[PDB]
């Protein structure tokens, strides 16, 4: 008949039908008597393909055959199972891999303590040295999961492995098997942050295809949508959008509005717009505009935000969108009455009405006609004049209003008209509303038309008196407005610059931040010099805020000083020393803005020019000596001096006539020679050895290094210095 | 190509020794997961009020 060896030798061949070989050998099996002789024969020849780790296709064909055949005293599949479980600890990596592989394939093709021994054995192999063996074990144990039974030992291992396995495929393996349960869900969605692109891509598929939209909190849905949308690879973008978003959209019945309700549109609206824009670009306009029956007044925030994001979209699809845009929007003026009638309906806590209000106020820049401008400006003015309106909408209305006017003087006038209106009757929020207009006027105002004599009215009437206001919310906008004015006229800045400094030290903290912004924007625009010809100490003030207890002030001071340096407006090896120190200071570890800002500045500032590097070289010794002289109490004593010196040498390399590193070598040899047995002797020598020394400095340097070799007593530093000596001698 | 003919003593392969699984000591998600800030050098030349 057909013997097992022929059957296997045949299955080895590429083009050889397997359905046939099953039938041929299958008879050979039943035709034999005492099946155990066949049983022992089957395993014997199966061994020839269990001892090969590499995926040669011949080997793979036999495995598939032996597995397919078997699953198409107790035996034969049970005989084979018994054999596999006894061999799963074999010293050969191949065997252990094949054993798990076969068990996996067996468990997958088939229609007693064997289930228990498998579950036990594969659970062991989850810890295999060889990654592939662990993978097969995961695939093997996949069918043997149980979500309902809490703390299953398969789902547990999966929970551990999916996050903790060194090997990406092992994780990617567990990610495709893991059953979406309550404890499991967080691990699965957590793989959308996996280092490997293939794991991240897959996490969105399993999420979209194995987990229900309900199982995920609203917060998680926004994290997934946002995260996947701006993920480093378009492979991951497309993966989330294809499987997850279009899947989440499908549960909505392919309706976008219903989907929005699920994304908590009020708070995370920016993300929602992104989702909208991504979704918009893949559906015809006839359908997107269809979601809107001219406006319908009783609406949800999901409805408002949709129409607003669609109108802005439709205006961007230039010509085609013109047709579909005119379908949903009424002519500019009739919209004004529509806008107005809504704002009136505002005195349980309907924040929701403020949000929806913004969305309609924001639709204004999708309208358009000279008559209509005046009647939009009309309602906008009316709304701004009306009390009871929340300040949240003020800024948005003012911006929409100022956009249209075109003329800086006409803006200042239309504004002046509005403030005088609000100033007639009689509290602090009426001052806030006004200053909000002043601010939004100053920031959009071009520098040319600086301080129109009408503005000086508002400056004298509203802006200046605002600074001494008893209400803190008033002062803040006052300062912000003053700084915007100072940017307009240099002489104006000069007069009130001293006032701005006053606000810096005396006033409330949140006002200070505004003050810093003001002062720094003015120093960046007019330089430091014109302000020392009243405040001779301006640089001292801003500097002492680096040692502030408030994060916003450290980061404000630090960044503002970094900006002044980068544009060559400030040269200070002191402040630069205080900056480098601030960046290494432990007190700053949770000041993300600060630490990140400087991290970019130091390098880009250093390599910009020699004078910049020279600034670092001048700061070298004072920095490390500030460190070495720090008492145990200060956070500075915590700092590592070697890290700082290496950074300074790094920033000062000529790979970015006596070079800067040549001057440094001098400074350092002069220092080493001053105190050769200093506690920092090790640091200075390392700095010395890592320098990029010019060729012509060698003879002069050699002279110094010899004397250093005489005075330095640390045997460690000496061996390094001798090593430097031989290099020079070359 | 697999030669099923020659009687190979497969004991060398299936035999037990030491030691199969990775050691008890052996890691965190820090290695597998990406760290979530962006500072453009252009913000260094930009104003706060505009």
Numbering used by the authors:
A (entry chain B): 7 to 78, 92 to 130, 137 to 318, 326 to 379, 393 to 413, 416 to 473, 478, 554 to 659, ...
B (entry chain A): 460 to 485, 490 to 499, 501 to 514
Q: What's the publication's text?
A:
Condensin I is a multi‐protein complex that plays an essential role in mitotic chromosome assembly and segregation in eukaryotes.
Their structures are essentially identical, but 4‐(2‐hydroxyethyl)‐1‐piperazineethanesulfonic acid (HEPES) is bound to only one of the two molecules. In the current report, we describe the HEPES‐bound hCAP‐G‐H subcomplex (a, b‐molecules) as a representative structure. The previous electron microscopy study also demonstrated that the HEAT‐repeat subunit of cohesin loader, Scc2, adopted several flexible conformations. These observations of the structural flexibility led us to speculate that our hCAP‐G‐H structure represents a snapshot of an “open conformation”, whereas the structure of its yeast counterpart represents a snapshot of a “closed conformation”. hCAP‐H interacts extensively with the concave surface of hCAP‐G at four major sites, whereas YCG1 interacts with BRN1 at five major sites 17.
